[PDB]
Paper text:
Here we demonstrate through structural, biochemical, biophysical and computational studies that despite lacking kinase motifs, antitoxin MenA1 induces auto-phosphorylation of [name] by repositioning the [name] phosphoacceptor [name] active site residue towards bound nucleotide. We analysed the MenAT1 co-expression sample by Liquid Chromatography Tandem Mass Spectrometry (LC-MS/MS), which confirmed that [name] is the site of [name] phosphorylation. The [name]-p structure shows clear density for a phosphothreonine (TPO) at position [name]. Alignment of each structure via C-alpha atoms only returned an RMSD of 0.410 Å (160 atoms), indicating a near identical topology of core domains and folds. In contrast, aligning the C-alpha atoms of the respective [name] loops returned an RMSD of 0.778 Å (7 atoms), indicating a larger shift between these specific loops. Close-up views revealed further changes caused by the presence of the phosphothreonine, such as steric occlusion of the active site. Structural alignments also revealed that residues R37 and F38 are both ejected from the toxin active site following phosphorylation. However, phosphorylation greatly reduces the net positive charge within the [name] active site. Accordingly, when [name] and [name]-p were incubated with E. coli tRNAs from the cell-free PURExpress translation system, we found that [name]-p was unable to inhibit GFP protein synthesis. When compared against the calculated Rst of this model, the observed Rst of the unknown species almost perfectly matches that of the hypothetical heterodimer, returning an observed/calculated Rst ratio of 0.97. These data suggest that [name]-p can form a stable heterodimer, but not a heterotrimeric complex.
The [name] NTase toxin family, MenT, modifies tRNAs to block translation. MenT toxin activity can be stringently regulated by diverse MenA antitoxins. MenT and AbiEii toxins share four highly conserved NTase motifs scattered throughout their structures, proposed to facilitate co-ordination of metals (motifs I and II), base stacking, and transfer of nucleotides to tRNA isoacceptors (motif III), and to contribute to catalysis (motif IV). Our study reveals a conserved mechanism for the control of tuberculosis toxins, and demonstrates how active site auto-phosphorylation can regulate the activity of widespread NTases.
Author numbering: 2 to 87, 95 to 141, 151 to 193
Amino acid sequence: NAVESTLRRVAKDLTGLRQRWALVGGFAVSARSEPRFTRDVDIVVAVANDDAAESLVRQLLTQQYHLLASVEQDAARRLAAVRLGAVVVDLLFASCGIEPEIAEAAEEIEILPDLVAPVATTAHLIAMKLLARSDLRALVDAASPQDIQDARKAIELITLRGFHRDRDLAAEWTRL
């Protein structure tokens, strides 16, 4: 209940600030395949640089959220994600490296009554789950062949940009 309310507000809010965002969590997956909800809202946001990110989060913290975590990294984009409180919202700026592909690529879908929201493509969802690690099994069982192709591409572009941790993701999959 808190979860749908949280999702509604942040969507209101992100749209409000004309951001390029995309659901990549429980609702997203549920939309692209079968019911796999969580008590977390996972969203990607395409933003220019760390200033953009910082600024966005400041603007959101004037609203009715609190900052529960900054996730940082040694690379050119310091600020990978943040986690906010209202139920928790993870915002991903540069966790996977294809945030802006994902957000261009998302499609608007009506998730709840009179809530349309952009939703990561199945292929992207597959990419991201692999990287985080039956959320995945679901997405794959559900995925069309072209879906699988796009996923491989998405995998590749993550690896190129070198957010692949140090993992052969291509590999990790054929296994699973």
